[PDB]
Design a protein that fits this description.
By secondary structure, the chain is of the alpha+beta class. The chain has helices spanning about 10-15, 20-30, 50-60; strands at about 1-5, 35, 40-45, 70-80, 85-90, 90-95, 120-125, 130-135. It contains 3 helices and 8 strands.
Length: about 140
Amino acid sequence: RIHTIKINPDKIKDVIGKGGSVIRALTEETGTTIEIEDDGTVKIAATDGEKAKHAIRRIEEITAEIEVGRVYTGKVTRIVDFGAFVAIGGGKEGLVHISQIADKRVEKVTDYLQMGQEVPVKVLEVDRQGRIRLSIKEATEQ
């Protein structure tokens, strides 16, 4: 049968890879046949539900990968002397530094951020252990 996942049209580029590079690997991993159709729809053809089911998870996981230069919507959990902690999907708390809040100079981040508040964030660095440095100031887009 045919199963599908529907995702935003910019995220089709994460799924194609470089000119079908990912597609080959996602075909090899899952064992499914992947057809793509407009408005960001990916149709996944298999003969057992369990394989398309896994392929549907594996696409969700491939666009849940944190990659550099990427802008996201995040939420302030903890504000320290040198930065604030901003959570993104799956419980990922990256560190926005004190110099990555605004164009103005910052003496304390606590003047600019409170807990519970939604902020837009761009990734800078991701460490091999799993630590993240984020930026609000290049994601603000005024």
